[PDB]
Amino acid sequence: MLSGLNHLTLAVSQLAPSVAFYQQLLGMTLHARWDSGAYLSCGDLWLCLSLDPQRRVTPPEESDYTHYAFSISEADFASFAARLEAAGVAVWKLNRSEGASHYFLDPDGHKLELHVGSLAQRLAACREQPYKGMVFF
Amino acid sequence: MLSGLNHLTLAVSQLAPSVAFYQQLLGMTLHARWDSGAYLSCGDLWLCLSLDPQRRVTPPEESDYTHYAFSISEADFASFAARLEAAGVAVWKLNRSEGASHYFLDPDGHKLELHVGSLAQRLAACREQPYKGMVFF
Numbered sequence A, B: 001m002l003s004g005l006n007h008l009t010l011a012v013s014q015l016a017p018s019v020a021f022y023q024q025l026l027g028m029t030l031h032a033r034w035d036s037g038a039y040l041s042c043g044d045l046w047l048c049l050s051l052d053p054q055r056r057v058t059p060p061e062e063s064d065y066t067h068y069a070f071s072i073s074e075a076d077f078a079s080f081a082a083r084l085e086a087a088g089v090a091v092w093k094l095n096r097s098e099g100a101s102h103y104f105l106d107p108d109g110h111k112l113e114l115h116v117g118s119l120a121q122r123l124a125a126c127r128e129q130p131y132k133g134m135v136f137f
């Protein structure tokens, strides 16, 4: 039986700018680096950056909705989003829902998100105002 | 400050086969389903499946190394891997070894992995046989 996410690996086109983004801009802990990768952590999350000649810097119009959201508190949300704006980090979507989300791109065009709130909170909001066709189990 | 992964969203081309894969075959818990998505959990992981007509199915040889690994115990690893092979789940190949892992594809070509072991165990293994150019912090 599966017990959770073990690690998330992102393919990157250039290691140095990606390590700078995840370690210095986003504040993740760098544990190890080698000629073709790095291991970082963010709380419980193990993140691997893998240098991949097949990775292209992908504009958000050319990739699908697959994305990775990181947890942050409401109190820290606005200042963290302002930090990203100062560094010139691109936004790929406006938040059009209730709840706090900021949608931003990494150097290779991986789609990231800052989100406040848990699955339980989302389910409770959906029970009050369900999506079309929604069934609960 | 970022505190970990809030959720993982995968774009899928057909909702029903994806829900069946993650719930029936992988054993994740299905919380809700609606006309264009579903919410599942796997331990602490909140997984969202999002119906996206822009999702293409690409051979693993022409997609990059971005992939998602799920935790499984030593006692369950081999029997779970054998169940996936018996169900006809397709495999893919990574360019390097990272310990006890089984690599498989979801119905849309997302690259998945079963892995035994934590980040701390991986760093200890790497100290004894480092990748090229490895530095530890």
Ligand SMILES: Nc1cc(-c2ccccc2)no1
Binding pocket: A133, A134, A135, B033, B034
């Ligand atoms: N065959 C089948 C359909 C469904 C369903 C569940 C929730 C929402 C819409 C459809 N569950 O099983």
Ligand SMILES: [Mn+2]
Binding pocket: A067, A069, A113, B007, B009
């Ligand atoms: Mn999201």
Ligand SMILES: [Mn+2]
Binding pocket: A007, A009, B067, B069, B098, B113
């Ligand atoms: Mn892996």
